[PDB]
Write a protein that binds this ligand. Structure first.
Ligand SMILES: Nc1cccc(-c2cnn3ccc(Nc4cccc(Cl)c4)nc23)c1
Ligand code: NI
Length: 328
């Protein structure tokens, strides 16, 4: 059966919770577990109330994200297809209770400072079930970092790291992220100068420009092992495909076009589409400490621009990583 909230979030942990993010799915908090920063995603399941404009998922409907989070968590310690470019999953609990007042305090603080698009999660009864995922802390999302990068050289590292990570997961797991908007990309400072990955037994490096990129949040993701596919079937989800005001919302439509609304299938082109969306964000919606006023900088910009205009002619992140001139 479920555990009480106190099992997962005893007082000292609840007291160190700060809200760091959200989605329709629920809420994301940073805290401390054994002197170690962690991120906690909390999802309401199985209940009758509308939450953030939607019905709650059942356990069965959350299971793919759990599975995919576990599969991707293994990649940092594998050998033939290895990368630290996803995120560690530490634990998964099924919790029962009303929402902790201290979480609501952290929720209120975020709403007061950043503003929320969600319902204040204060209406759940003491029998409410939640899934609580504890992840490794992966840094700050790309959207909040949009005014914080040093230069387009940093941009280039981020794109290279993202492409490599997606390629390794394609090779290992026939993985598609399927929802890689700039909120789902994390940046953390690193003293490492070069980052390592292995793709089908071949190890290569990427200059870090002082950041380690982590791809997170596998709500729409798909993968397979030994012909058994795990995914989010969105073939009857009307609203996902009717969004507007951002190239993000075109990506959902373009994916559906590519796969003919068959989400069980493997279409690694979806990774390229997300990578195109991310490149676009980088060229249009970022402000850099170093401006576009030196030779080296104009050259990187031209390279990222050329990448943007050619990358949709590649078939997967693996194709991009292995063949695109940007990464040579
Ligand atoms: N897989 C996954 C899911 C959810 C959160 C995390 C996770 C791990 N570290 N970390 C650090 C920051 C952060 N911020 C954030 C911001 C907006 C939205 C979302 Cl979903 C997350 N999320 C995480 C990982
Ligand atoms: Ni436990």
């Amino acid at each position: 059966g479920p555990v009480p909230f106190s099992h997962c979030l005893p007082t000292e942990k609840l007291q160190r919770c700060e809200k760091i993010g959200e989605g329709v799915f629920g809420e994301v908090f940073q805290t401390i577990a054994d002197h170690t920063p962690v991120a906690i995603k909390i999802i309401a399941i199985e209940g009758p109330d509308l939450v953030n404009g939607s019905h709650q998922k059942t356990f069965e409907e959350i299971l793919p994200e759990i599975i995919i989070s576990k599969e991707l968590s293994l990649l940092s310690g594998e050998v033939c297809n290895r990368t630290e470019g996803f995120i560690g999953l530490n634990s998964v609990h099924c919790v029962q209770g009303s929402y902790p007042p201290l979480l609501l305090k952290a929720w209120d603080h975020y709403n007061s400072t950043k503003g929320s698009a969600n319902d204040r999660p204060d209406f759940f009864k003491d029998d409410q079930l939640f899934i609580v995922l504890e992840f490794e802390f992966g840094g700050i999302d790309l959207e909040q970092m949009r005014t914080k990068l040093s230069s387009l050289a940093t941009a280039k590292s981020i794109l290279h790291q993202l492409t490599a990570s997606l390629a390794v997961a394609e090779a290992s797991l026939r993985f598609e992220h399927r929802d890689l908007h700039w909120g789902n990309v994390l940046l953390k400072k690193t003293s490492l100068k070069k980052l390592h990955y292995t793709l089908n037994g071949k190890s290569s490096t990427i200059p870090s420009c002082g950041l380690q990129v982590s791809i997170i949040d596998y709500t729409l993701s798909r993968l397979e092992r030994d012909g058994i596919v795990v995914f989010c079937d969105v073939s009857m989800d009307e609203d996902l495909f009717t969004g507007d005001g951002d190239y993000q919302f075109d990506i959902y439509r373009l994916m559906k076009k590519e796969n003919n609304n068959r989400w069980g299938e493997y279409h690694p082109y979806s990774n390229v589409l997300w990578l195109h969306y991310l490149t676009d964000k980088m060229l249009k919606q970022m402000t850099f400490k170093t401006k576009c006023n030196t030779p080296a900088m104009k050259q990187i910009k031209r390279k990222i621009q050329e990448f943007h205009r050619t990358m949709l002619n590649f078939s997967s992140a693996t194709d991009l990583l292995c063949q695109h001139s940007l990464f040579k």
